[PDB]
Amino acid sequence: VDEANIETHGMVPMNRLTDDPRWLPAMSERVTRMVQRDRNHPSVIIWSLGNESGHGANHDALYRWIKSVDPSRPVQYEGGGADTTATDIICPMYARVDEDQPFPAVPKWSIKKWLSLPGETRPLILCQYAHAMGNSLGGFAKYWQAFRQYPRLQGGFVWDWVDQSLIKYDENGNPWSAYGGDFGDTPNDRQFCMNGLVFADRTPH
Amino acid sequence: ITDSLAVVLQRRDWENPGVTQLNRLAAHPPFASWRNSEEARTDRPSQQLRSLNGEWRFAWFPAPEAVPESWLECDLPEADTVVVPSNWQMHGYDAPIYTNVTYPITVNPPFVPTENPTGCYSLTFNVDESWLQEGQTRIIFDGVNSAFHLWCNGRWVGYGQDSRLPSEFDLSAFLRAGENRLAVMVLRWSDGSYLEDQDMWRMSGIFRDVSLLHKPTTQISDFHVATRFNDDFSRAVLEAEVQMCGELRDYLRVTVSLWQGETQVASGTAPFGGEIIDERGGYADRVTLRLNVENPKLWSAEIPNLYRAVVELHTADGTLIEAEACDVGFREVRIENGLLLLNGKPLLIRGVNRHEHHPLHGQVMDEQTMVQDILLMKQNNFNAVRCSHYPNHPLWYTLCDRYGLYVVDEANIETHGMVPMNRLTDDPRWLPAMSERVTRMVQRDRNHPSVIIWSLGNESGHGANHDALYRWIKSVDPSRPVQYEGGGADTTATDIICPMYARVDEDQPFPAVPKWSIKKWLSLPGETRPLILCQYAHAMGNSLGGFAKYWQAFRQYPRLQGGFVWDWVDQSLIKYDENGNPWSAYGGDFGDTPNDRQFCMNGLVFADRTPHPALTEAKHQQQFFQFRLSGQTIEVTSEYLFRHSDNELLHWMVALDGKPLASGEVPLDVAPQGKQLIELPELPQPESAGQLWLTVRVVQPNATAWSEAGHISAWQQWRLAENLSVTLPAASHAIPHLTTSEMDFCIELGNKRWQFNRQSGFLSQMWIGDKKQLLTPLRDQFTRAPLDNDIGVSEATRIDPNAWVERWKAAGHYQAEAALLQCTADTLADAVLITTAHAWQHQGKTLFISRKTYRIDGSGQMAITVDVEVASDTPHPARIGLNCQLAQVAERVNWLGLGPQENYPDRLTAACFDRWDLPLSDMYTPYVFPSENGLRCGTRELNYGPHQWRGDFQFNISRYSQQQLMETSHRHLLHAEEGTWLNIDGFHMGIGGDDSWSPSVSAEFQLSAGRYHYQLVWCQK
Amino acid sequence: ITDSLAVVLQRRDWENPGVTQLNRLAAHPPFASWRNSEEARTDRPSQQLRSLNGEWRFAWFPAPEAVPESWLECDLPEADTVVVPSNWQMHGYDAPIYTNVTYPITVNPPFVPTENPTGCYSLTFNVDESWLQEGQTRIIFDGVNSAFHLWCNGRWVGYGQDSRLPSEFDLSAFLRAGENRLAVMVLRWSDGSYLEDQDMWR
Ligand SMILES: Cc1cc(C=O)c(OCc2ccc(O[C@@H]3O[C@H](CO)[C@H](O)[C@H](O)[C@H]3O)cc2)c(-c2nc3ccccc3s2)c1
Ligand SMILES: Cc1cc(C=O)c(OCc2ccc(O[C@@H]3O[C@H](CO)[C@H](O)[C@H](O)[C@H]3O)cc2)c(-c2nc3ccccc3s2)c1
Ligand SMILES: [Mg+2]
Ligand SMILES: [Mg+2]
Ligand SMILES: [Mg+2]
Ligand SMILES: [Mg+2]
Ligand code: NA
Ligand code: NA
Ligand code: NA
Ligand code: NA
Ligand code: NA
């Protein structure tokens, strides 16, 4: 999945820049210039309009731009409820197998319920599931049971591969794995950079 | 030093489609920042919105680098004082350029000639202390062609592109109390010129209003008004989204009220805070107010009911901060089951394309001309207008809102001259420049109910940027369909099949971009969309042939919902001769090269808004009352969708060969889409010879906002009965005498003599007493002075062999010499009979043969019979008749046949059979490019001076020979010849006009029969 | 004079989402410009695509306006030798920031802090006259975070944004035979950073 370098997660709402036409130029260069560079690679099967930036009208514009200039690949985008007009795939992040999380505007339905909502035609492939932060991947079996039972459940992408720990050296030059704040960075989100199936040195969890 | 021309010009922002603006403020609907809401509710002047129109200082330069540094600090001594808004071409500072498709600059995007005419505008003006103590002072340039840098008090403010949308900059940090100086440097050419290749005059300058706007630092920054409905339009919700800028505080509130006249209809109030829209929450700086409206008065072009929405920004204790306002039209535009609906009813678009053009002021628009245009449109049964091909002056949308016209609002993008047309619109590097021309159009005009359809531009092929911006509009504003003709008129970037110059029945199967028959187009597999031509019926010169063929098809096919004629006004400009008499100029008349000559004049009206003959043909075919007659019962059908005929009578005349017999009036009471049957009183039934004709007009007894009392809105004619003449003519007391020379047959009867030349075989002269009657003999004519539609794009330099004029010229039509075959005289009991036969040849090929009999009888009446052969393999001739130059010049022309206006075989539906009496001046049509003109068809009797001709013919009569018209390129160089040129045709070819670059006269109107016959009688009175 | 930092930094092109590049060439799939068809078929190295990876000269500054004009004409004595490619936080010049959702800078688009860490990268390198007698020579920056201005031999070339796609500029009219010097001013923050809020180390 080749993803454009667009994330506006910290805007309030997440929509603020991606729905503004004054940001459509900046956003189009990050989508279009990706397609122009990577369009010949067979490994790329799906284009992504970015991550966690709500759902703005610029998303719908650039979705249709990709469709027009490269019909050979589906386009996906999770923002604004995972099933917007700018996605060919229902690509939720952390939608649970049986339990609904009915957040206002942007609900995370049961992946099994989500398929059968009236008028919903598309496959579902979680762009992110099974958050692997420390001692986790509890209930991972429950996804794959559901994946195998339901044809339109075609799997997902685990979040994620590598702990984003950095090496620091103490006063005597011993290396140790550091996370949020360990460099005087404030504010910070501490451990939440470490979500990997493997440690930073690629040792398996 | 960073404000110096040296630094600002060195970045060359006008040769870089990545920089379309610098420091420009966001677009939005029209603001006035009223500080009293009753002012806002009544749309009275705002003392927070000053105009800077008036006398500015201007200085021209060949290139921006030639502008001295001194001009930022101080006024240039050799500058002139000049009115703004203006186009600097209209003041004479360089030439306007007329080019159609070929760019007026070398195609080398994004670069521009080093020779780039630059307009240096300066203004010294006062600003109150009040505007600088509190709030935000901005300047608004409504239109700058084509790009500009802006200085204020020597400091640099910003840069702007797109010539037809307003550019706004914040001036608060730049202005001082008292005297200030603006410095505006305007470039004729910029990278934006590559998306501004409309077929029009290429001018430049500050050609729309300049204004200062004062707002409080806490302000309404944007507002959007929508109208939802239930199934039967009995309940509506008005949704009003309001966004603000400045410091949000908990005490801030918004009230939006809805008025209809001085009645408050609804009102709501809320603090700021929108719905949750995603995981980060909602817009703290926005609020949406929903008002209920029961039984709303709906907006349409038939009845433009308006409400007014007032948006007050205030505190909770009531203190008003500012108010904005707009007109509201309750209407729904949807496409449903293949039909474009307005309020649940399928529109039938009686459209026209209208440029912003004035023969004196150029591309500067004024209220008087806009209103004159809207009145003339609505008076000729026009429904809708296409803003070809850019956003208009803001006042235009307000006038269509109130007078009632459907508007296609079209983005300022045309790349016609690129090869292929696709080149820039498919290139992602031009997506930004294109997005700002589309998005800023929608942000400004999305509250006008007159706007029912958004257009992505004109003639720019089909690129992936078109698809991107199509989806942008759908996402941002579902209220309105999006249309675009480029790349074959049915691309993925259009909700409407919007072909230009698709014909009714015949396909034009061009590779990649075919124009199918509009009827066939609808039926193509998978195609579900309505079809509304974005341009049809090219009205260049003597044109709109076959107009009736379109409207029959529009009415028969549901999914054919009409089209927009090209176009409304001749883009003529005024020049002054050596004496200072004005004349209408076109392409090349300003030294502009290369140029596209007459192609700028495509209008139903002249530049001064005098109608062409084609306008009534439009008015007749577009009429809202259709008629049928069975017996003496009239079926009236209303094509109005929303109104009853509560301002309409039906006047009816019955006349025998012009003589009126019976009249009457009947009230009209037809429901929309309804019928009314009317039984006429026992009509006159005379045994008298002649054709009995019934004529009905529809008459509006009451004045409207757009029409005077007694305005005629529709008409129709029927032939009721005919009584063939069977009475023998009255006998004569005398026999006409034949005198035979070797050289002439001369015929005498009373005071009258007829001379026939036996070498030429033509009627050489005719005498009444001593007074001779002819200056040129009476000879056959098989040619006409070529119409724009006959010439097409053919020129002396690059001939097009397939144009009609060229096929004629190549076949020798225009240089063919008559060769006398037979010339005999006989004496009968009661008359003399001259029989003739000529062959017209060219380089050995016989093109035409004409066999005549002239029969002069005791009553002084000359009966001429003509029988023509036309070679099957020569091009079908322009006409088949005779012509002569008469000695007489009378002041009036009197005829029984179709009139009163100019009419041709494929453009005579609006004409009515009656006796017409006009001045000879009105028998000539002053087309700016002279051609064949002023024909009237289906005429049985023509009267001029002592002469009468009877028969069944088409004629024109003028002081201008077909030869002079053919050889003269402007109407102002025509001179009255001695006497009067008379063309009488048995048959005359259609004028065409489906387009004007290819043959467009349809087969049924071509003279292909091979043998023709017609009969005249020439008479004295 | 219009290549000076005073003029180029004046425009503050990193605080304006209407300017994401100046003089940048079009994007395209990966090019190598092989002049032998068998080399292209076997994906072997191309003599027309050289790496500039290696030992560059680098100096850190609290804000772009703190960079001395000297630096375009001449290497800074205070500078250090550092390997490229690299992140300057990994060399200890300032802290990497780990924030998930909340932006690491005050949310005030399109503006960024006045105190905007800037990295001044220079490299002196040779160009064979072969390259300048014919054809086009361009520089490829496969990744620069967050935005940068590029000088070659003291003259200004262009500007670029988007930290994860290549920025290419034509250098043919800037290069001379033998010794050349690139001057790359990289800003940590720019209007582009508003679109780069991925939950990772900044
Ligand atoms: C290069 C090119 C473009 C187009 C266009 O696509 C085109 O066909 C339609 C056309 C449209 C607009 C136009 O010029 C004006 O433009 C104005 C402003 O837009 C109005 O819209 C009017 O339409 C109009 O007066 C002129 C021709 C033709 C053709 N040439 C020929 C010549 C001979 C035989 C077949 C063809 S086919 C070529
Ligand atoms: C504003 C907002 C956004 C989202 C997001 O949509 C969100 O819930 C999902 C979420 C996604 C990514 C994330 O951080 C990481 O970021 C990585 C790189 O970008 C990957 O995306 C990974 O997904 C991820 O580990 C953290 C949380 C919540 C919620 N907050 C709370 C708090 C308490 C109770 C319920 C909720 S619901 C709010
Ligand atoms: Mg520019
Ligand atoms: Mg055109
Ligand atoms: Mg920028
Ligand atoms: Mg995130
Ligand atoms: Na499955
Ligand atoms: Na994380
Ligand atoms: Na119809
Ligand atoms: Na034209
Ligand atoms: Na009536």
DSSP string, B15-53: G-TT-SEESPPPP-S----BSSHHHHHHT---TTEEE--
Say if CB A79 and CB A55 are below 8 A apart: yes
Question: What angle separates helix B464-476 from helix B431-445, to the nearest 10 degrees?
Answer: 30
Residue C200 and residue A193: Cβ atoms within 8 Å? yes
DSSP string over C113-141: -SS--EEEEEEEEEE-HHHHHSS--EEEE
Distance (Å) from CA B2 to ligand 5 centroid = 18
Question: Chain C contacts of A192, Cβ < 8 Å?
Answer: 98, 100, 199
CA distance C102 to chain A (A): 5
Tell how strand C167-170 and strand B307-315 pair up.
unpaired
CA distance A101 to chain B (A): 12
Strand-pairing partners, residue C127, are C178
State residue A36 phi and psi, 5-degree precision: -65, -35
Question: Chain B contacts of A104, Cβ < 8 Å?
Answer: 276
Interface-testing mutation among A8, A14, A52, A60, with chain B (most B C-beta atoms within 10 A):
A60
Residue C165 and residue A10: Cβ atoms within 8 Å? no
Ligand closest to B112 (CA) is 3
Q: In Å, what is the CA distance from B213 to each residue of A205, B137, B182, B244, B285?
A: 64, 6, 15, 16, 22
Mutate to test the pocket of ligand 1, among B389, B408, B416 (most ligand atoms within 8 A of CB): B416
Q: How many helices (H) and strands (E) does chain B have?
A: 14, 59
Tell how strand A153-158 and strand A124-129 pair up.
parallel
Interface-testing mutation among B16, B162, B245, B431, with chain C (most C C-beta atoms within 10 A):
B16
Which residue, judged by its Cα, is nearest atom 17 of ligand 2? C199
- Read off the DSSP letter of residue A22: G
Longest pairwise C-alpha distance within chain B: 113
Tell how strand B560-565 and strand B531-536 pair up.
parallel
**Given the CA of residue B459, which atom of ligand 1 is nearest to it?**
6
Q: How many CB atoms lie within 10 A of CB C40?
A: 13
Residue C96 and residue A166: Cβ atoms within 8 Å? yes
Distance (Å) from CA B810 to ligand 1 centroid = 25
CA-closest candidate to residue B216, choices B241, B242, B246, B243: B246
Q: What share of chain B is helix, strand, coil (3-state, %, to 5)?
A: 15, 40, 45
Ligand closest to B279 (CA) is 2
CA-closest candidate to residue B61, choices B42, B46, B76, B43: B76
Mutate to test the pocket of ligand 1, among B101, B421, B533, B566 (most ligand atoms within 8 A of CB): B101
**Given the CA of residue B540, which atom of ligand 1 is nearest to it?**
25
d(CA B948, CA B408): 51
Tell me how many residue pairs between chain A and chain B have CB atoms under 8 A apart: 97
Residue A36 and residue B428: Cβ atoms within 8 Å? yes
Residue C19 and residue B21: Cβ atoms within 8 Å? no
What does the domain layout of chain B look like in residue ranges? 1-216, 217-331, 332-622, 623-728, 729-1021
Strand-pairing partners, residue B386, are B353, B408
Chain A residue with CA closest to C102: the answer is A10
d(CA B743, CA B757): 6
Chain A residue with CA closest to C165: the answer is A34
Which residue, judged by its Cα, is nearest atom 29 of ligand 1? B997
Say if CB B203 and CB B184 are below 8 A apart: no
CA-closest candidate to residue B601, choices B365, B842, B928: B928
Residue B480, C-beta contacts closer than 8 angstroms, at least 6 positions apart: B333, B451, B452, B453, B454, B473
- End-to-end CA, chain C: 35
CA-closest candidate to residue C7, choices B932, B7, B539, A5: B7
Experimental method: X-ray
Residue C29 and residue A40: Cβ atoms within 8 Å? yes
Which among A22, A32, A106 is the nearest to B279, CB-wise?
A: A106
3-class DSSP state for residue B642?
coil
Helix (H) or strand (E) holding B809, with range, is: helix B804-811
3-class DSSP state for residue B72?
helix
Residue A12 and residue B278: Cβ atoms within 8 Å? no
Chain A residue with CA closest to B468: the answer is A61
Residue B571, C-beta contacts closer than 8 angstroms, at least 6 positions apart: B98, B200, B201, B355, B357, B586, B600, B601, B602, B603, B607
Say if CB B533 and CB B557 are below 8 A apart: no
Question: What angle separates helix B464-476 from helix A57-69, to the nearest 10 degrees?
Answer: 150
Which among A9, A36, A64 is the nearest to B471, CB-wise?
A: A64
The label of the residue with tokens 């015929």 reads B747
Give Cα C25 to chain centroid, integer Å: 14
Say if CB A61 and CB B468 are below 8 A apart: yes
Chain A residue with CA closest to C199: the answer is A193
Strand-pairing partners, residue B850, are B838, B868
Residue B19 and residue C20: Cβ atoms within 8 Å? no
d(CA C33, CA C50): 11
- Read off the DSSP letter of residue B466: H
Say if CB B517 and CB B507 are below 8 A apart: yes
**Resolution in units of Å:** 2.8
Question: Chain C contacts of A53, Cβ < 8 Å?
Answer: 195
Instruction: Tell the burial category of C30 from Cβ atoms under 10 Å away from its Cβ (0-12, 13-18, 19+).
Output: exposed
d(CA B658, CA B660): 6
State residue A2 phi and psi, 5-degree precision: -90, 115
Neighbours of chain C (3+ CB pairs under 8 A): A, B
Say if CB B418 and CB B424 are below 8 A apart: yes
d(CA C40, CA B901): 75
Neighbours of chain B (3+ CB pairs under 8 A): A, C
Distance (Å) from CA C195 to ligand 3 centroid = 24
Question: What angle separates helix B394-403 from helix B367-379, to the nearest 10 degrees?
Answer: 40
Tokens at B490, concatenated: 């049915």
**Ramachandran sector of residue A178 (left: φ over 0; alpha: ψ -120 to 50; beta: rest):** beta
**Given the CA of residue B199, which atom of ligand 1 is nearest to it?**
18
CB of B279 closer than 6 angstroms to any ligand 2 atom: yes
CA-closest candidate to residue B483, choices B538, B410, B588, B397: B410
d(CA B362, CA B377): 21
CA-closest candidate to residue B715, choices B612, B625, B604: B625
Distance (Å) from CA C200 to ligand 8 centroid = 7
Interface-testing mutation among C97, C195, C196, C200, with chain A (most A C-beta atoms within 10 A):
C195
Residue B431 and residue A25: Cβ atoms within 8 Å? yes
Chain B residue with CA closest to A106: the answer is B278
d(CA B789, CA B539): 9
Q: What is the length of chain A?
A: 205
Those residues of chain B whose CB sits closer than 8 Å to some CB in chain A are 26, 275-284, 428, 431-432, 435-436, 439-440, 443, 464-465, 467-472, 474-476, 492
Residue C47, C-beta contacts closer than 8 angstroms, at least 6 positions apart: C35
Strand-pairing partners, residue B715, are B697
- Read off the DSSP letter of residue B549: H
Helix (H) or strand (E) holding B152, with range, is: strand B147-152
Question: Chain A contacts of C107, Cβ < 8 Å?
Answer: 10-12
d(CA B936, CA B952): 11
**Ramachandran sector of residue B181 (left: φ over 0; alpha: ψ -120 to 50; beta: rest):** beta
Those residues of chain C whose CB sits closer than 8 Å to some CB in chain A are 17-18, 20-21, 26-30, 89-90, 95-103, 107, 109, 161-166, 191-192, 194-201
d(CA C6, CA B425): 37
3-class DSSP state for residue B14?
helix
3-class DSSP state for residue A109?
coil
Residue A26 and residue C197: Cβ atoms within 8 Å? no
The label of the residue with tokens 């209408």 reads B584
The label of the residue with tokens 């249309």 reads B483
Q: Is C199 annotated as a binding residue?
A: yes
- Read off the DSSP letter of residue B965: H
3-class DSSP state for residue B13?
helix
Q: In Å, what is the CA distance from A82 to each residue of A13, A49, A127, B433?
A: 16, 12, 9, 30
Helix (H) or strand (E) holding B522, with range, is: helix B518-523
Give Cα B437 to chain centroid, integer Å: 24
